[PDB]
Design a binder for this molecule. Structure first.
Ligand SMILES: NC(=O)c1ccc[n+]([C@@H]2O[C@H](COP(=O)([O-])OP(=O)(O)OC[C@H]3O[C@@H](n4cnc5c(N)ncnc54)[C@H](OP(=O)(O)O)[C@@H]3O)[C@@H](O)[C@H]2O)c1
Length: 273
């Protein structure tokens, strides 16, 4: 795998959706440098259907070397975003990295999508990423690292990605369009980039959406790609990174260590031709 480096020692990483899955896995990689992880997600109490809370994530994060600040945050509510940001500053003194990882998905089409799901996608994905970015920016300006990373895809405008689940595509594409804009707006001050996985990534949310277990990569791959980006200087900006591509640059050749079952065919991720 791709080894930790120390770069992030004492750096504060604010990650939306770090209660489980990819978000949590990014936290754990940054955590191994002795980073401080601000966990911004909704799950404060055991739910019968989801696994893990902000508090179990916090524990995991401490067990591999980091400090964790669990905050209850629904990114649909600006007040909860700004309260967690304030808690991060009071506690840690600053924010050096924001990862906009929280998202909601519904693969329905025009007549199928209930308005409450439309709004949920628009409001968690596009709106959430904007507000989380707006709150963190004034602190990112002061960071020696200063990275914003959106988990969202390259802007691939082939009609095939819109013919179905259009609402979901627009919601995700909006996060990547903020990359396009904010990279330019904050050139020299904040690096802003997207990261997206070449393949499906094993996750209890992807299991529910997907038999699919064996066709996936480990969350380790995205964690590791995201760690690579975090070490780049502030001039690394306006990019739409794909996990596999960024790790080939860093010397990784044998990708089997990242597969759930080495050998088996892997499911292409959405939005890549
Ligand atoms: N897994 C894959 O194959 C794959 C493929 C393509 C893209 N992705 C992207 O990767 C990201 C994470 O996916 P995943 O596999 O980790 O799915 P997941 O298990 O559903 O992760 C979503 C995370 O975001 C949080 N979240 C959801 N709504 C939120 C809200 N309103 N406010 C704050 N946090 C919220 C969830 O925690 P709480 O429930 O505690 O709020 C959870 O930690 C998403 O951006 C997704 O589009 C994943």
């Amino acid at each position: 795998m791709l080894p930790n480096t120390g770069r992030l020692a004492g750096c504060t990483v604010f990650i939306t959706g770090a209660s489980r899955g990819i978000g949590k896995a990014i936290a754990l990689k940054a955590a191994k440098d002795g980073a401080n992880i601000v966990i911004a997600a909704k799950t404060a109490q055991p739910h019968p259907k989801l696994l893990g809370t902000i508090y179990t994530a916090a524990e995991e994060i401490e067990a591999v070397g980091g400090k964790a600040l669990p905050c209850i945050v629904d990114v649909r509510d600006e007040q909860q975003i700004s309260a967690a940001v304030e808690k991060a500053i009071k506690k840690f003194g600053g924010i050096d990295i924001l990862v906009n990882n929280a998202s909601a998905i519904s693969l329905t089409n025009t007549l199928d999508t209930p308005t409450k799901r439309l709004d949920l996608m628009m409001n968690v994905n596009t709106r959430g990423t904007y507000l989380a970015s707006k709150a963190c920016i004034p602190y990112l300006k002061k960071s020696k690292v200063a990275h914003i990373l959106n988990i969202s895809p390259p802007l691939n405008l082939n009609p095939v990605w819109f013919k179905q689940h259009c609402a979901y595509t627009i919601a995700k594409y909006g996060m990547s369009m903020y990359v396009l804009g904010m990279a330019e707006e904050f050139k020299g001050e904040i690096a802003v980039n997207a990261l997206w996985p070449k393949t499906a990534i094993h996750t209890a949310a992807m299991d529910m959406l997907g038999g699919i277990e064996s066709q996936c990569r480990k969350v380790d791959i995205i964690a590791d790609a995201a760690y690579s980006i975090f070490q780049k200087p502030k001039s690394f900006t306006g990019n739409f990174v794909i996990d596999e591509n960024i790790l080939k640059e860093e010397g990784i050749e044998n990708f089997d260590v990242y597969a759930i079952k080495p050998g088996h065919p892997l499911q292409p991720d959405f939005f890549l031709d």
